[PDB]
Structure 1
Amino acid sequence: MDPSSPNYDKWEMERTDITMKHKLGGGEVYEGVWKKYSLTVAVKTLDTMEVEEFLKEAAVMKEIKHPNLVQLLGVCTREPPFYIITEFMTYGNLLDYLRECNRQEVSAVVLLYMATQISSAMEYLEKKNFIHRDLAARNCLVGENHLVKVADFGLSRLMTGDTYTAHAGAKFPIKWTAPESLAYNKFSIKSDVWAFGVLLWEIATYGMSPYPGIDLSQVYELLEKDYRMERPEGCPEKVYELMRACWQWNPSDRPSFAEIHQAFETMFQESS
């Protein structure tokens, strides 16, 4: 826009500057090119019932910056249809990736690195007192040299699979949702820690669906009296001990991300 103008927004960019394309199977995200720089990018778009919510996401994205969080390049919220441009992550989402990778190339060390990256992003978000709400591998993205960034798709309605079910005013990744949050709709950074713990598990197992076989309805009950996923084949003892600490029934017991990242750094440096 216009610098002197009263509504100047650095992030608002020319909608013509982006050569929209086809969908990256998802709201809806297509893949786009930013002609100016010949760079492929991710464009998230929206007569729908969540405008206050979209622009909110835009707004937030404008406040966060970190090497391990998907990067917002610009927006298009001056005139509809509403856009949201972020860098593209050639490898798509962490969960499929883990399911279609060459495990010789994606060994234990690499998997330990991915967790370290993710933990680092969460430490930031924790420092900025920001609550993710839906941390999980389907929500992390994969780039070159095993670069992993944390994101948010708003998979809630995009998905209905069996991943998400109704609790509160909507759907919730039951298997990723912490106790307190399933029972009181209490979401905190400690709730994200829980989910992280699960995401770890997703990582340890190259992308296997959590609490396999178990039905959503019974998840809480089990966790209630202290039941947990078992260490996955190949997972180091120290990693696993970590998951458990994340999975403590009392939020205040769960380690901070600052602590979680400090533990990984020490492990990832000891292994490379």
Structure 2
Amino acid sequence: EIDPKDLTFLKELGTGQFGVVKYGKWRGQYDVAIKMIKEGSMSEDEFIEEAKVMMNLSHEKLVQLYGVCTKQRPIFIITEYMANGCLLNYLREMRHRFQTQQLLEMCKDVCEAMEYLESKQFLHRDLAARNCLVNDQGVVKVSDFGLSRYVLDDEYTSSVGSKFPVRWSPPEVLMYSKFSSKSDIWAFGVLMWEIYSLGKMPYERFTNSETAEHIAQGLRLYRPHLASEKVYTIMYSCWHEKADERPTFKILLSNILDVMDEN
């Protein structure tokens, strides 16, 4: 429980699934982001009841959830600040600057975070470049892990809703709402594709339902120009139809490190 008196609001960062997010400082020194949770946007009682595990998740490649302010309305979620914003926009804006080594390093950053989450049996549930953030030194970190569970918005929570991350979902999520470590694995593959395509929309020009239909029948994302065959093999392994044939994040990290060593 953070004392809201210790927070200084400094800048509007935009709006996300829970409403307004602001940049500020904690105790005049530490850079933070502060989600001000819009009333009715979140299952607050449920989040508060369950939130301690999420705060104890600690890793260099996670965007840390520092604490909460719950003795007030609206409630706040205080996290680590990331000066370069979300990875999807960062890729798009610096598109002509990246070397292939840096793209691989981004994949490694995310994979390390996810390997940690996997070891804690904690699901992200909405992994995608938009839910990775970038610090002032270009380090990529995974953000808002586990929060999708508390979203109150039928357009997001229903698999036929317009905000559901269909393009990041395996068949068993689309058909059965069966989330597991292996649905995060699928999403990580799509994320690697977002990285190597330098921020393109997966299945662009397909609607969500067309995407569902086509992946169910075995359609997969093509190899981006900048991805080597070894890199494509890694992302492709995430997309096995059967969840039990997909690798673990431990295995993916080993795969990524091996490519780095060869390069």
CA separation in 2, counterparts of 1:134 and 1:34? 28
Q: Tell me the SS of whatever aligns to 1:144.
A: coil
**1:93-172 mapped onto 2 (5 Å cutoff):** 93-101=86-94, 103-104=96-97, 106-152=98-144, 166-167=158-159, 171-172=163-164
Q: Residue in 1 aligned with 2:13? A: 24
1:169-221 Cα offsets, whole Å, 9 max, x none, are: 99521111110000001000101100100011000111000012112112222
CA separation in 2, counterparts of 1:53 and 1:143? 30
Identity of aligned residues (%): 44
The reply to whether residue 85 of structure 1 matches residue 74 of structure 2 is no
Q: Residue in 2 aligned with 1:41? A: 32
Structure 2 unaligned spans of 5+: none
CA separation in 2, counterparts of 1:88 and 1:158? 26
Q: Residue in 2 aligned with 1:55? A: 48
Following TM superposition, by how much is the alpha carbon of 1:234 offset from its aligned partner in structure 2, in angstroms? 1.3
Q: Residue in 2 aligned with 1:5? A: none
CA separation in 2, counterparts of 1:148 and 1:113? 9
- Structure showing greater Rg: 1
Aligned length: 255
Q: Tell me the SS of whatever aligns to 1:25.
A: strand
Asked if structure 2 preserves the Cα contact closer than 8 Å seen for 1:125 and 1:131, the reply is: yes
The reply to whether residue 236 of structure 1 matches residue 228 of structure 2 is yes
CA separation in 2, counterparts of 1:263 and 1:34? 39
Following TM superposition, by how much is the alpha carbon of 1:158 offset from its aligned partner in structure 2, in angstroms? 8.9
CA separation in 2, counterparts of 1:170 and 1:99? 23
The reply to whether residue 64 of structure 1 matches residue 53 of structure 2 is no
CA separation in 2, counterparts of 1:243 and 1:60? 29
Q: Residue in 2 aligned with 1:6? A: none
Asked if structure 2 preserves the Cα contact closer than 8 Å seen for 1:34 and 1:41, the reply is: yes
Aligned residue type for 1:125: L
Q: Which segment is superposed worse, 24-33 or 194-203?
A: 24-33
Distance 1:180 1:158, change over 3 A: closer
Distance 1:53 1:93, change over 3 A: farther
Asked if structure 1 preserves the Cα contact closer than 8 Å seen for 2:31 and 2:81, the reply is: yes
CA separation in 2, counterparts of 1:250 and 1:43? 39
Asked if structure 2 preserves the Cα contact closer than 8 Å seen for 1:110 and 1:146, the reply is: no
CA separation in 2, counterparts of 1:149 and 1:223? 28
Q: Which segment is superposed worse, 116-125 or 95-104?
A: 95-104
CA separation in 2, counterparts of 1:107 and 1:119? 19
State the Cα RMSD in Å. Answer: 2.4
Q: Residue in 2 aligned with 1:200? A: 192
CA separation in 1, counterparts of 2:168 and 2:3? 38
Structure 1 unaligned spans of 5+: 1-11
CA separation in 2, counterparts of 1:55 and 1:175? 30
Distance 1:112 1:65, change over 3 A: same
1:104-152 Cα offsets, whole Å, 9 max, x none, are: 3x21100100000101111111111111110000000001322111012
Q: Residue in 1 aligned with 2:169? A: 177
Asked if structure 2 preserves the Cα contact closer than 8 Å seen for 1:135 and 1:192, the reply is: yes
Aligned residue type for 1:40: D
